[PDB]
Curated annotation (Swiss-Prot):
EC number: 1.21.3.3
One Pfam family it belongs to: FAD_binding_4
Source organism (scientific name): Eschscholzia californica
Gene Ontology biological process terms, A to Z: alkaloid metabolic process
Cellular compartment(s): Cytoplasmic vesicle
Glycosylation sites: N16, N401, N449
Cofactor comment text: Binds 1 FAD per subunit in a bicovalent manner.
Name of the featured protein: Reticuline oxidase
UniProt family annotation: Belongs to the oxygen-dependent FAD-linked oxidoreductase family.
UniProt keyword annotations, A-Z: Alkaloid metabolism, Cytoplasmic vesicle, Disulfide bond, FAD, Flavoprotein, Glycoprotein, Oxidoreductase, Signal
Placement of covalent cross-link 6-(S-cysteinyl)-8alpha-(pros-histidyl)-FAD (His-Cys): H82-C144
PTM notes: The FAD cofactor is bound via a bicovalent 6-S-cysteinyl, 8alpha-N1-histidyl FAD linkage.
InterPro entries: BBE (IPR012951), FAD-bd_PCMH (IPR016166), FAD-bd_PCMH-like_sf (IPR036318), FAD-bd_PCMH_sub1 (IPR016167), FAD-bd_PCMH_sub2 (IPR016169), Oxid_FAD_bind_N (IPR006094), Oxy_OxRdtase_FAD_BS (IPR006093)
Length: 502
């Protein structure tokens, strides 16, 4: 069986594969931990793949899937390995890890201003490729350079330019999807329902994206950014955050103001991240008017290329570092939760948040405003439904290093209580979420459990409608169409509709 798999792979020309090894220093273990981006799922007790396959072409990817199906393995796809819940490299059933790191080719077409992007490519590699080819082109996606396009675009992809250009998935014009039978389908082949579904319906559900075709987007040769940390007390920090929410959502689409926040007793720190599609004169004039309380000075505003701004906002030293997929910025175990809002947050919400942060220096928040282009895109244009009416995205994070692992339970408890505190102020009925911010606290499906599987649609509605709202129904239809046998599944994958043949 394990040798039948390898025999099948060899017969089909797939040669880059390594079977499980207990050797701490084996190539298997080296490849396994190479793209584990959350150390929370890195220890010895976690499930390990029986084999790791590294396909290097669309045919190798197709044949790998075909071979794996002859057996009874669970398929796991890994691009960047940034899954918050480690769903790309863990499974409660014996699984084969298909790692896509060798599928990292980016092809820029300056004549059509589009690009073909193999799904193993990271955002950083994509950004670097774009900046290299042109000074007037960029793309809208997340801020983390080591995030893989495979999972990221599959789940939407929100970033600093989303108020201008929407999500990464909102700018996909074609794609190559490899289905459960190993069929190689482009947009025309897969159909519009499936092409709709893959653009934010969540990774690991529809098949294996081989490559994305994206539209490259206009950017000025110079943009303006700032990254300013305000060190203040809770009263001022609360005033700043309460005003920020209005400034952020209301800003014109050419502007973005986001926040990173934390505390430690009396000391509160708020890192303001600013972006403007233009020069510093207009940028400073805008914030002087709308947010004079930030106390920004001329030297805070930095003019640079789009490429430089994305490296800068990511806290990288240089643009070159975008092209390093194995670069480890923060190597801490973490757990995060997210909220979307529909009504303005009361000042007391920010106050309470800051109070709880002051008691836990390992915790922090990330605040993003929607609006702009996000409110001009229809709720069903792609699976991501949180458009017009959505005000903010609020992220709560707790992170720790190896020397603090004994406080793990305490950290998680703190995060749980933070989330409970925020309940009354955020979206309700249901409490909304974001599939790229996958959260298993919401629950999960054991696909080996008959009674659960029979009621999968209703059960899955808990997280399904949080992620996709009314788009949930259409997603189920697309799923049934493209993966009726449920070859691509995980605790929160869209359920296919059953067949009476049971
Ligand atoms: C670690 C990390 C994540 C971030 C960060 N910043 C983000 C941001 O600024 N905006 C966002 O919208 N999201 C941000 N996130 C979260 C990431 O967007 C998500 O975690 C992405 O889903 C991660 O993608 P990836 O790096 O590829 O993670 P994987 O674990 O490999 O995949 C996730 C999921 O998708 C499936 N999958 C992978 N590859 C494919 C292909 N090619 N085809 C179909 N499905 C695929 C996996 O099986 C898994 O289920 C900042 C940081 C630091
Ligand atoms: C299967 O895939 C892995 C990962 O891509 C392959 O490992 C890679 O092999 C290449 C050589 O073909 C390595 O290139 C060079 O490595 C040396 C190491 O000292 C370095 O000096 C060079 O600058 C260059 O990096 C590459 O490092 C390596 N990548 C990783 C992540 O290990 C492997 O070759 C493939 N296996 C088979 C059988 O094809
Ligand atoms: C199936 O899932 C249900 C609900 O989670 C659980 O109560 C039950 O023990 C499971 N049954 C089996 C056979 O594992
Ligand atoms: Mg050894």
């Amino acid at each position: 069986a394990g040798n039948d798999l390898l025999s099948c792979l060899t017969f089909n020309g797939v040669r880059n594969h390594t079977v499980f090894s207990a050797d701490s220093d084996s190539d298997f273990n080296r490849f396994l931990h190479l793209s584990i981006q959350n150390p929370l799922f890195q220890n010895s007790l976690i499930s390990k793949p029986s084999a790791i396959i590294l396909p290097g072409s669309k045919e190798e990817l197709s044949n790998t899937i075909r071979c794996i199906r002859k057996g009874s393995w669970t398929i796991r796809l890994r691009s960047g390995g940034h899954s918050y819940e480690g769903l790309s490299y863990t499974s409660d059933t014996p699984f084969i890890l298909i790692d896509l790191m060798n599928l990292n080719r980016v092809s820029i077409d300056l004549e059509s201003e589009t690009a073909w992007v193999e799904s193993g490519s990271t955002l950083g590699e994509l950004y670097y490729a774009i900046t290299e080819s042109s000074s007037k082109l960029g793309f809208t996606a997340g801020w983390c350079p080591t995030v893989g396009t495979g999972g990221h675009i599959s789940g939407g992809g929100f970033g600093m330019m989303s108020r201008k250009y929407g999500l990464a998935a909102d700018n996909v014009v074609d794609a190559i999807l490899i289905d459960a039978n190993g069929a190689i389908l482009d947009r025309q082949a897969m159909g519009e329902d499936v092409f709709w579904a893959i653009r934010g319906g969540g990774g690991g559900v529809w098949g294996a994206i081989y490559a994305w075709k994206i539209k490259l987007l206009p950017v000025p040769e110079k943009v303006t950014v700032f990254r300013v940390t305000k060190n203040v007390a809770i009263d001022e920090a609360t005033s700043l955050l309460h005003k920020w929410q209005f400034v952020a959502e209301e800003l014109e689409e050419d502007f973005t103001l986001s926040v990173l926040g934390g505390a430690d007793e009396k000391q509160v720190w708020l890192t303001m991240l600013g972006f403007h599609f233009g020069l510093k004169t207009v940028a400073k004039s805008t914030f002087d008017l709308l947010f004079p309380e930030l106390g920004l000075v001329e030297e805070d505003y930095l003019e640079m290329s789009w490429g430089e701004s994305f490296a800068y906002l990511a806290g990288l030293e240089t643009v070159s570092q975008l092209n390093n997929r194995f670069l480890k910025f923060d190597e801490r175990a973490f757990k995060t939760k997210v909220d979307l809002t529909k009504e303005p947050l009361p000042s007391k919400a920010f106050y309470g948040l800051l109070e709880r942060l002051s008691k836990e220096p390992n915790g922090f928040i990330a605040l993003n405003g929607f609006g702009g282009q996000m409110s001009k895109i229809s709720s069903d244009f792609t699976p991501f439904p949180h458009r017009s009416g959505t005000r903010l995205m609020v992220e709560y994070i707790v992170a720790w290093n190896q020397s603090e692992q004994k406080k793990k339970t305490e950290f998680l408890d703190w995060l749980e209580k933070v989330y409970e505190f925020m309940k009354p102020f955020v979206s309700k009925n249901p409490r909304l979420g974001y599939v790229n911010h996958i959260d298993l606290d919401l629950g999960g499906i054991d696909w080996g459990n008959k009674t659960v599987v029979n009621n999968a649609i209703e059960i899955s509605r808990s997280w399904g409608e949080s992620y996709f709202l009314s788009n949930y129904e259409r997603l189920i239809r697309a799923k049934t169409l493209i993966d009726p046998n449920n070859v691509f599944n995980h605790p929160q994958s869209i359920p296919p509709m059953a067949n009476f043949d049971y």
